[PDB]
């Protein structure tokens, strides 16, 4: 250390031997923390908070865990950031990306101990990932021409995604709900059109998807409670003292009877607007704002249903289901399109009462009712079902799939191995380490179940080298099998994102050799 000081008090510097030490300790720390939640037989963690008023949640997702953990190592924050982005991109594989990105760094520290310059490893890995992604592409199978065959693939993808979650207790029941829900969107990737309503009580198997729609609102007082063959007008306008006349006007009169005259003119304005609404020949009215008690009785005298305070989400969803138009100014009744549902009634679920729409016109949106025993099950069920809906929506956008259960990893690990046997130099060593990292992912799945991982992986390595490119693990019995027969299937887009993102982070971390920290701010709260 130079005798002269260059840093202010509290600032610290770390260099080559210490910098690479700290960065590797952090990465493997986060990788080993989440390995327990991987595969069809991983277990779940408990997150309890000291700051957020002792909030408690039970989860298996690898991205939810990494968001709540308060990491402070600079290198560990890079790993958390990729997992959050991956969740917002395809919605699955958050656990696989971080484990793989951590296993690459575990092999990278051993190579440095053998006196190989870091730039040599990166150039070596860059060739390894190119040959790995190309081999994956040649493994893709693309359906979509046959509805019957494509329908089978959607059931296989949804069945695999739900395996590692709590929904595996009822996988058959929950596979049908997830698939049929996505077929309603008619190819539009608006996932917000699916409203998952979760309310406590009853068994987890009582959950279902409603054939129509459900609204958790309340109708006006002294209005019909149920209508057959309804015509719906969807509006976004003011009705509680709509007289917000944008100007800065004011009333200046010299008597009292003038005020009582102007006051009566206010009600005439509201009454006239109501008549123009009823001119459309509607029998159901939906508004996104409040409804005052004076216009409430106008509908109550005319025999109409008025729903109030259905926010932007509640209105846009109704537009897709019934096909109406969100209208305002009510001046041209011919140009506005109304909705149509066969029946509207009030239903009771648990304790609450919700509005039931049945026999809708379009049905391009839906609602899902979830039941359960604890708030932890309801949250876990909803979060698990989010993974299934997203990955299915990506499949419809790009309908090419790749086999899973370790069949995919072993194929790419072999393609890099063949390349490393022709390349001279120290780059050959680095490429082999890439194959050691990919093959760990099938190993970790076997370890969690209590099987001889070394024996099973050894059989897979031989099977894939001799041309049986569909071999892979079978969890229910701990032997080998064919995926074309069993049906374990992933998405090409999901696996591609897992491979490319993971290989990048081990590149950005590995190029770092100096760590510098500014003197932290002190806690002096308000």
Partner 1 sequence: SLGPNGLDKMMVDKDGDVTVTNDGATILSMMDVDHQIAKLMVELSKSQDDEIGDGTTGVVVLAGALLEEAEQLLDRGIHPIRIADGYEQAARVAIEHLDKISDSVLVDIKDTEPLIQTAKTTLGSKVVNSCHRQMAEIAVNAVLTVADMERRDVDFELIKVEGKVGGRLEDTKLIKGVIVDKDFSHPQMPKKVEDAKIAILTCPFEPPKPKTKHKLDVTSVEDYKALQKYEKEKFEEMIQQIKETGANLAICQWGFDDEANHLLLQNNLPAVRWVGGPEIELIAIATGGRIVPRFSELTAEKLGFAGLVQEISFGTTKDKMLVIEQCKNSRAVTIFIRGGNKMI
Partner 2 sequence: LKQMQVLHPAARMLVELSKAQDIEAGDGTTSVVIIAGSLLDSCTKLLQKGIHPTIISESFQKALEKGIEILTDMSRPVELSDRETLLNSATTSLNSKVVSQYSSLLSPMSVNAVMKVIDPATATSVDLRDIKIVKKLGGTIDDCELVEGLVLTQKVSNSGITRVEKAKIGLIQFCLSAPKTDMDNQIVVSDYAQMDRVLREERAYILNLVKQIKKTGCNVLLIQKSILRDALSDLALHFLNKMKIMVIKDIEREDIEFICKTIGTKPVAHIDQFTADMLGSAELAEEVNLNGSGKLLKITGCASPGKT
Partner 3 sequence: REIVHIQAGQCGNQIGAKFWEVISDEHGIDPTGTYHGDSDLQLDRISVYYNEATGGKYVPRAILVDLEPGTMDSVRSGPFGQIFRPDNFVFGQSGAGNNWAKGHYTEGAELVDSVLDVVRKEAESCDCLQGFQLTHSLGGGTGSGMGTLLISKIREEYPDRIMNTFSVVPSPKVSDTVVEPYNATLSVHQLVENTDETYCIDNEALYDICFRTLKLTTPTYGDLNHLVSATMSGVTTCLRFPGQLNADLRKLAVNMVPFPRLHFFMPGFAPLTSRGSQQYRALTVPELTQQVFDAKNMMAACDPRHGRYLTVAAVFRGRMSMKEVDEQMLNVQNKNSSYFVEWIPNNVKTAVCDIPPRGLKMAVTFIGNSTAIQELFKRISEQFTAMFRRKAFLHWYTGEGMDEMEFTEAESNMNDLVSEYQQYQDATAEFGEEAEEEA
Ligand X SMILES: Nc1ncnc2c1ncn2[C@@H]1O[C@H](COP(=O)(O)OP(=O)(O)O)[C@@H](O)[C@H]1O
- What is the nearest approach in angstroms of ligand X to the Cβ of residue 183? 23
For residues 454 and 49, give the distance between their C-alpha atoms in angstroms, rounded to a whole number: 39
| Angle between helix 118-138 and 94-112 (nearest 10) | 140
* Between 35 and 317, CB nearer to partner 2: 35
Residue 268 binds partner 3 (CB under 8 A): no
| Angle between helix 440-449 and 94-112 (nearest 10) | 120
Residues 48-107 within binding reach of partner 2 (CB under 8 A): 48, 56
* Between 264 and 521, CB nearer to partner 3: 521
Using CB under 8 A as the criterion, what x/- string covers residues 466-505 for binding partner 3? ----------------------------------------
Residue 525 binds partner 3 (CB under 8 A): yes
Residue 96 binds ligand X (CB under 6 A): yes
Residues 505-524 within binding reach of partner 3 (CB under 8 A): 524
Residue 526 binds partner 3 (CB under 8 A): yes
* Between 77 and 309, CB nearer to partner 1: 77
Residue 238 binds partner 2 (CB under 8 A): no
Q: Are 25 and 71 in contact (CB under 8 A)?
A: no
How many Cα neighbours within 13 Å face the side chain of 388? Answer: 34
Exactly one of 163, 236, 423, 443 binds ligand X (CB under 6 A); which one?
A: 163
Residue 255 binds partner 2 (CB under 8 A): yes
- Listed residue (511, 520, 519, 522) closest to 119, CA to CA: 511
In sequence order, which residues have a C-beta less than 8 Å from that of residue 458 and are 6 or more positions away? none
For residues 406 and 154, give the distance between their C-alpha atoms in angstroms, rounded to a whole number: 20
Exactly one of 30, 38, 82, 370 binds partner 1 (CB under 8 A); which one?
A: 82
Dihedral angle, C-alpha 272, 275, 279, 283, nearest 10 °: 150
In sequence order, which residues have a C-beta less than 8 Å from that of residue 399 and are 6 or more positions away? 142, 143, 144, 150, 153
Residue 91 binds ligand X (CB under 6 A): no
96 is in an annotated binding site: yes
Q: Which secondary-structure segment (H or E) carries 95?
A: helix 94-112
For residues 388 and 49, give the distance between their C-alpha atoms in angstroms, rounded to a whole number: 28
Q: Are 309 and 289 in contact (CB under 8 A)?
A: yes
Using CB under 6 A as the criterion, what x/- string covers residues 42-71 for binding ligand X? --------------------x---------
Residue 5 binds partner 1 (CB under 8 A): yes
- What is the nearest approach in angstroms of ligand X to the Cβ of residue 394? 13
Exactly one of 71, 116, 122, 200 binds partner 2 (CB under 8 A); which one?
A: 200
- Dump the DSSP string for 369-438: EE-BSSHHHHHHHHHHHHHHHHHHHHHHHS-EEEE-TTHHHHHHHHHHHHHHTT--STHHHHHHHHHHHH
Residues tagged in the binding site annotation for ADP: 39, 93-96, 163-164, 405, 490, 495
Residues tagged in the binding site annotation for Mg(2+): 92
* Positions in the binding site for partner 2 (CB under 8 A): 41, 46, 48, 56, 169, 200-202, 221-222, 241, 243, 245, 249-257, 259-260, 262-263, 266-267, 293-294, 296-297, 300, 348, 350-351, 353, 372-376, 450
């Amino acid at each position: 250390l130079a005798p002269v000081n260059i840093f202010k008090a509290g600032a610290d510097e770390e260099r080559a031997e210490t910098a690479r030490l700290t960065s590797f300790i952090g990465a493997i720390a986060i990788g080993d923390l989440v390995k327990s939640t991987l595969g069809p037989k991983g277990m779940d963690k408990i997150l309890l908070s000291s700051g957020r008023d002792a909030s408690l949640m039970v989860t298996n997702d690898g991205a939810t865990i990494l968001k709540n953990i308060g990491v402070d190592n600079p290198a560990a924050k890079v790993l958390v950031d990729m997992s959050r982005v991956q969740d917002d991109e395809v919605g699955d594989g958050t656990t696989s990306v971080t484990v793989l990105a951590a296993e690459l760094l575990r092999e990278a520290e051993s190579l440095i101990a053998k006196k190989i310059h870091p730039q040599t490893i990166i150039a070596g890995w860059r060739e390894a990932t190119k040959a790995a992604r190309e081999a994956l592409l040649s493994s893709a199978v693309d359906h979509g021409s046959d509805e019957v065959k494509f329908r089978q693939d959607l059931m296989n993808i949804a069945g695999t995604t739900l395996s590692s979650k709590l929904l595996t207790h009822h996988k058959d029941h929950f596979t049908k709900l997830a698939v049929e829900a996505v077929l309603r969107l008619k190819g539009s990737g608006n996932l917000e059109a699916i409203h998952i309503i979760k309310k406590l009580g009853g068994s987890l198997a009582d959950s279902y998807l409603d054939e129509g729609f459900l609204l958790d609102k309340k109708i006006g007082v002294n209005q019909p409670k149920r209508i057959e063959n309804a015509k719906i007008l969807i509006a976004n306008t003011g009705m509680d003292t709509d007289k917000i006349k944008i100007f800065g006007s004011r009333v200046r009169v010299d008597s009292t009877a003038k005020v009582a005259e102007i006051e009566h003119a206010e009600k005439e304005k509201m009454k006239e607007k109501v008549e123009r609404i009823l001119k459309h020949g509607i029998n159901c009215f939906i508004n996104r704002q409040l409804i005052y008690n004076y216009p409430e009785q106008l509908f109550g005298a005319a025999g109409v249903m008025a729903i109030e305070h259905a926010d932007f989400a509640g209105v846009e969803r109704l537009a897709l289901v019934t096909g109406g138009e969100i209208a305002s100014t009510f001046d041209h009744p011919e140009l506005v399109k109304l909705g149509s549902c066969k029946l509207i009634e009030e239903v009771m679920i648990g304790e609450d009462k919700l509005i039931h729409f049945s026999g809708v016109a379009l049905g391009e949106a839906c609602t899902i009712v979830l039941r359960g025993a604890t708030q932890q099950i309801l949250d876990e069920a909803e979060r698990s079902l989010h993974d299934a809906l997203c990955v299915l929506a990506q499949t419809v956008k790009d309908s090419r799939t790749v086999y899973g259960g370790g069949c995919s990893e072993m194929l790419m690990a072999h393609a890099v191995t063949q390349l490393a046997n022709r390349t001279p130099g120290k780059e050959a060593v680095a490429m082999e380490s890439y194959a050691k990292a990919l093959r760990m992912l099938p190993t970790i799945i076997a370890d969690n179940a209590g099987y001889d991982s070394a024996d099973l992986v050894a059989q897979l390595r031989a099977a894939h080298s001799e041309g049986n490119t569909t071999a892979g693990l079978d969890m229910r019995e701990g032997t080998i099998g064919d995926m074309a027969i069993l049906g374990i299937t992933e998405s090409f887009q999901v696996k591609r994102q897992v491979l490319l993102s993971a290989a990048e982070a081990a590149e950005v971390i590995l190029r770092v050799d100096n760590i510098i920290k500014a003197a932290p701010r002190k806690r002096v709260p308000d």
